[PDB]
Symmetry: C4
Subunit: 454 residues, 4 copies
Amino acid sequence: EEDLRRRLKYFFMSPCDKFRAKGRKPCKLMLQVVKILVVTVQLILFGLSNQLVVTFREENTIAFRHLFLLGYSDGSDDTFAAYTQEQLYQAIFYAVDQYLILPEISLGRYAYVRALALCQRYYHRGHVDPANDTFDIDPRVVTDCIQVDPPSASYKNLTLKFHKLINVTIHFQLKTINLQSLINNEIPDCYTFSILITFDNKAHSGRIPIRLETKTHIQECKSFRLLFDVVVILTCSLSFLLCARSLLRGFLLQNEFVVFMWRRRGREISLWERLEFVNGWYILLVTSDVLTISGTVMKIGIEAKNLASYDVCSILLGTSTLLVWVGVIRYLTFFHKYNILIATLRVALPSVMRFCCCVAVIYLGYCFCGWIVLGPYHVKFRSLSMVSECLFSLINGDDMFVTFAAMQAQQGHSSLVWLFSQLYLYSFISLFIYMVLSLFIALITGAYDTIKHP
Amino acid sequence: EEDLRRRLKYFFMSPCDKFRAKGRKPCKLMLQVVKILVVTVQLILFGLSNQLVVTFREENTIAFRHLFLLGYSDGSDDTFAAYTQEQLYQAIFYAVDQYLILPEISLGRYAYVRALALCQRYYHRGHVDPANDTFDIDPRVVTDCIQVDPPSASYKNLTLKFHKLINVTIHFQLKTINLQSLINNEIPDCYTFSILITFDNKAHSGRIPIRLETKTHIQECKSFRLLFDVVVILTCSLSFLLCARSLLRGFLLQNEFVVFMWRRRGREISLWERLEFVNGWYILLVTSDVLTISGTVMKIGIEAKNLASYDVCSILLGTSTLLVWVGVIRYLTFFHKYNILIATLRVALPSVMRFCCCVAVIYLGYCFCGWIVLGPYHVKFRSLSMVSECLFSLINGDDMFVTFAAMQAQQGHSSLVWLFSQLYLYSFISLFIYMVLSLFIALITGAYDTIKHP
Amino acid sequence: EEDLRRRLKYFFMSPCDKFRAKGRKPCKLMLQVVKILVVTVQLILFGLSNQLVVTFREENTIAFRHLFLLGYSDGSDDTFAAYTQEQLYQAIFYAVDQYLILPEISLGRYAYVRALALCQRYYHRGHVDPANDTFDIDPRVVTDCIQVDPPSASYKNLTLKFHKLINVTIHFQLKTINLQSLINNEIPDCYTFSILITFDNKAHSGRIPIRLETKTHIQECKSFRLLFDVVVILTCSLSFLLCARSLLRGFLLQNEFVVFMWRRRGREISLWERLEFVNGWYILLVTSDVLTISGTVMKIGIEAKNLASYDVCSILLGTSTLLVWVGVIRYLTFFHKYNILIATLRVALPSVMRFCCCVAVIYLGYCFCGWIVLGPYHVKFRSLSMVSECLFSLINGDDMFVTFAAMQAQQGHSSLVWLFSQLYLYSFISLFIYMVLSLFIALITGAYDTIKHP
Amino acid sequence: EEDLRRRLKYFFMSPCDKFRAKGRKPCKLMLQVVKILVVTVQLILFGLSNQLVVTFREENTIAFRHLFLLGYSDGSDDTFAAYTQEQLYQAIFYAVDQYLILPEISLGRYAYVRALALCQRYYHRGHVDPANDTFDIDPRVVTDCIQVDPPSASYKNLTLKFHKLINVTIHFQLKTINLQSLINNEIPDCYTFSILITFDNKAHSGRIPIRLETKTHIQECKSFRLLFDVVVILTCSLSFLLCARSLLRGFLLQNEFVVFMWRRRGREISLWERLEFVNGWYILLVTSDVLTISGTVMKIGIEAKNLASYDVCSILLGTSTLLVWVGVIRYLTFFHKYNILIATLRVALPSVMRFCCCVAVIYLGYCFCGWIVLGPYHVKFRSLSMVSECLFSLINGDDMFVTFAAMQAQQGHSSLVWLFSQLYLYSFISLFIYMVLSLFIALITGAYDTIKHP
Ligand SMILES: *[C@@H]1O[C@H](CO)[C@@H](O[C@@H]2O[C@H](CO)[C@@H](O)[C@H](O)[C@H]2NC(C)=O)[C@H](O)[C@H]1NC(C)=O
Ligand SMILES: *[C@@H]1O[C@H](CO)[C@@H](O[C@@H]2O[C@H](CO)[C@@H](O)[C@H](O)[C@H]2NC(C)=O)[C@H](O)[C@H]1NC(C)=O
Ligand SMILES: *[C@@H]1O[C@H](CO)[C@@H](O[C@@H]2O[C@H](CO)[C@@H](O)[C@H](O)[C@H]2NC(C)=O)[C@H](O)[C@H]1NC(C)=O
Ligand SMILES: *[C@@H]1O[C@H](CO)[C@@H](O[C@@H]2O[C@H](CO)[C@@H](O)[C@H](O)[C@H]2NC(C)=O)[C@H](O)[C@H]1NC(C)=O
Ligand code: NA
């Protein structure tokens, strides 16, 4: 009788009450504090390594734009184009000539890689004739390359085909050595820059945009942190073991209560009792455990095998650290102790969540109105997604006088879309500022009263 | 006695309670779910058709600006003008010369349409003489055209009349073929671009702005969705039939109660009883029915007859989809069941709506103060409507440091409008942020308490 | 006994109750409705007259900038300067040469006014010698003019004195005729443009800014609204008579109650009874009366005598219309009737107003901290007033990422102002968003509960 | 018995009640009012002295940029660079040639200081060879100067070493005389401008940025306020004496109560009684005392010894004035009198402060997610601090449509970071606008109810 009662009472005993009664079982909570310190120190010490890499890439791409592009100002990337015929010839010829004299010009020690390959791509047999609308078009793509070697009569006399042109692309490589890595007490890693100038002509609209994308391949030239990540996986795995034993002990006393409620037979106490046995935090911490050790094993594999995709490793570690810090709030809820602190998902959280569904639908309806009506006349409403970004910017207010001014400029001079757009925007702003934010305050205040005073 | 009572009770029976008692009358609610899916799939599949058209127009207008306008940078449309005399001559002569050599320049396959017509418009007899203020002006407009044919001594030697000039306009057509429509598994539609360069001289202020408007006419050259819109009109019309029978059955039991309250004679129960009989949602859904089928019949007529005005069809379909999604909230109010959920328009909604009138008037008064006082000194307050956009931007905060800086620049150096403008703007911001948003929260919270706890 | 009681009861009788009992005393309330219509129609019909004038001025100033200034792009007014020596000579010589050939260049019919007067202003005897710090300076200003007549050897060979130069100013006039005023069914008013180019050298810092201010003088060349303003002053004056009789009748029954409370002798009922006798709205309406008729008499005097100062007339009419529209709320408070609706200034309004004093002081303290500390390092914090505009923009959020970026750029590289500026800005934003807006909601909600439920 | 009781009652007696009973003890409160006036008049009269200095510096730096830098537009400081080889030579040679003819060019009376010293800094023995990855690098820095004297064959023929270059710096001085200080009734202070042009090549990335920093040294050439600061330190020190006696008298009656509660022996009344004896404001005012007199003694020392570091003096005075104005609120709490008005730090302030900890952690977790994941692809997320500025700007809404557009531009075209970034940003905006601001309102309203109605 007595032993079965106190095991439940020891189970829901707060650890601050449990230290002042039992005395010194420290090894559980200490490694949670160690986990927060060790994971964030790994994340910061990795993040500075990326920033030292990335800005060395970002300055080199800009220095390639001022060298290989013709007439490139700064901050005008997307509206950079070649409209006439001679501008396309001049933008090709200037890009090659700046390659063949590159050691006599640039300032970083750029070396060649043994070369440059110009290549255009036109249709197999295209005949566009707008006087008779005759087309006889195989959409088969025939790529016609041309080679240029650096230390010409072969390079010039080039004939583009402006009536079936798809792409004019230039591809080459460059190798450079980081010299910042002298003082940083490391072996300077040699980089390989792979450049692909693109003269895109997909839309065939008499406007060819131009862009220049780079790509790196970091390789060591002609042991601290390697120990540190082993520290992280051992620390985090011991938490994965120990918390799993805590939850299955929670299942042990989950079933131990119910069997005792058959000899008593208290009407087979429902699902809202067995759910009151487990926890509200250890599932969050153990989900952080699996995410952390998965990202770190991927991080160990990268820096020996290949260093290209710092992408899935980044999206896993950045979520693991988020779950750790949000997992610290438990320490600030030992002071609270309302006796389950999980019935909020029965009581208060449903009445805010179906309101969140009601807000989500009305917001979706104004998306589907704005994208079709104010699509062809306005510049910021092309895709459905950019409509979603523009209306969600209008809620808090970021982009709001620019859209009324752009609406005021012409808007067709139809004076029906404009009378629609005033009635559209004023209603949508005045709805989600006043009659939605205020309902949301009334719901959360009703929740907080319902949790506290009962 | 019993049959008349239960017909009322079956009427207000919720459908989730009605399935668990009666059993399987599914055909009503199912087509509402089908309606939401079918209307939104029509709207999305139409909207992508517009975006593939519109961006092909928008790139071609920009490529016409870089070809036919002199000295056109990008993003400087409105402050593009010709101030001297030679700039107006050079902007005309350059626009014609780029037309007569257009196949040797541009990149899209632009073909002529058999031509270019330059034409100026000056007054019949105007004599402006500022030394004696003598005017003898017939405002009769005499248009003097001139023809130019492309494959000149006729084109040059042109004499403008800068003392009675109204407009110098150039009009011509261009025909091109979309070549993007090869891979999209369709017949490539040939377009016809109609260009109208405008040298406007309306205000006679020594500043002539320049702009270039295009206009398209899409025509097929030398059956999926056509079935799909027939699916929409049949689906939506069956809802228009079936919901109308539901509401007139609502009128049937509207009158059936009142006649039974004459044999009882319960003091001839008032308008707030017969209004409690109908609904709060089927009028919204049937208004979506009429709007949907009207827009679709207009959409069928467009793609065979003429394709110019995608304007009223767009403004009807974009409203119909809005009413559908806002009409989904009924499914989230079966869980609620407060026994009419329409008396809010008697109880709670009036006490927010007359407050909304009180906010609307004060906002209108600050419009009429700002437009006359801060009109002549500030750039953003010309019309009354742009004042309305500027103050409504200042409420949420979008344009707020720019207007104080523009106020700080000169503001006449009268130092009376500036002392007014500080007292104007600070009071208007501090009113509608604090003492209006907070009253609105107190009203909605009082509404939600009044609906719930009584 | 009975007659003295009902005169009080008729006094506080609402007019909607007073029509349904007494019957048809309409002439009081009708002219209030007439007042709202007539004043706003005057204000709108005057405001369109200003906008037709002002944009004709604003385009002519821009067309003067492109003609008389050297190398003027658009939207770069304040950072337009002449730094070297030859740039100051070239900006003078170009401005005069464009004046002497002005009818052969510009497009509006600009005529001369019989002329141009160049004039510089230098000190009487200034000797600046930085090798010995010797100054012997009379600050007496000696103006040296030079005349130029238009249809030169006299104009050139000009010698500026760059070691004691204060101002180089050019002044002349231009006359033009509005030709837009043909179709507008009026007599076209001839304008006189007075231009003053300024080469300011006040700060002696090796940077001379340049600006060009115009000034107009509208005069008729070689009766609807005149009646309409007489309609306004007669309408508004009859309200000034009739409401004054209403308030002095309010003083009549103010004293009639108190004398009857000496025969009763109800302990000499206090100031919060005699204040409950008058009103809360007629003082607002009669203040709108005096402001309206004052501005209109000034408006009559302007359009015959001189048309320069549309400034005090504008600041009076724009306030009168504001008081009228805010004065409409009384019609929406007949429905309310809480029996004085002025004791809010005893009950609820003091407890928000001393909180408004407490917010006003803390805001003032952060002004005096920011202007001295973040003054010399940051560009937006020069005056105290521009600090007030910048912090008040940071409250609602308009200018907030720009100031952190400007703080991040250098900020001295002292790393003490930066550590101060992070702690400054984060505390000031987080205070007035959370812990002030929320107290203000709690005060207004406490006010609304106190007014309603007691 | 009686004397011990009334000393406590006189202690908590409000001064407005204390004047109407005792009568005229004015000297305490009067100097607090004098303190507010005297400190703010010192602060304003000092702040205008800084602004007259700083704008004379800020215009001279800009006028040095247009003279000594090649091809400098305005507002383009950070993206000003030299990418090729000839641009670095031309930017050096142009900067020196504009120095050797400086009195024949500039407008302010700039004089030389007897000179210019060009000097480059390259590595001791560097060999970068990307064909074999051979490096043999001493990172020892060998500075190679070159002298130029102004009134050349020595200046030209300069050989940079582009393969081991670190810095190319030019240093010289200029002396000028303020001439604005004639009319300001003072002795004109001669300034010394020290200029350091920097051609930084730290990252070795083929992109050399260019910047020009100045530095002043104000010295008088060949008594009002000096008295005024002595007034401030004497005023503020008398407050430091008098308030200290008030607090130690507070300790005197702190111990006088407790000894009387041993003869009574009221169970040794706890820490929440002895804390109710002192104050809540005099510690704030005396902290303002020490800060004020410290900053002023530093201010006296500056204007005789050296005038460089107006930095710690500014950061102390700007905090002292803040504490004074926030210290005025006590006058508005004599009207209040809730009988301690400090138990809020026991009652209400803890339940908002641990919520402020819970908000602070979640905000920190989204920092550590955003900086690693959205680091390499986005321009505004480089450091951790600029992530903190960007997310805190997104809360109130300042930078919100720019970040979605920059996310929409490429974002790698990996379509996994983009699907992450939508889910990242939408959750973070919707959390701290709705479900945090509303909890904060519910906490402050619960605080205000708890303070008032109990
Ligand atoms: C230039 O256009 C060609 C098509 O003419 C592109 O080649 C295709 O690219 C897509 C995506 O990489 C592939 O799915 C196709 O298989 C490619 N087809 C052929 C025949 O190569 C080419 O990628 C374009 N250039 C760039 C830089 O995008
Ligand atoms: C150029 O000015 C002429 C007037 O001189 C405009 O012609 C008028 O245009 C309006 C609107 O289209 C019509 O209501 C009038 O009937 C037209 N009058 C004549 C005589 O044609 C012309 O439209 C202007 N050009 C442009 C491009 O707007
Ligand atoms: C150019 O500088 C002169 C001073 O050298 C200015 O003349 C003074 O202007 C102020 C304000 O108008 C008057 O209070 C003084 O009496 C004027 N003094 C003299 C001697 O004229 C002149 O105004 C400046 N030019 C401009 C356009 O502001
Ligand atoms: C140019 O580069 C040199 C290094 O080659 C810089 O000199 C160092 O500057 C730092 C910071 O001032 C000192 O800690 C080092 O002791 C300096 N080393 C030497 C050898 O001087 C120099 O400061 C750079 N120029 C500028 C303007 O920053
Ligand atoms: Na902005």
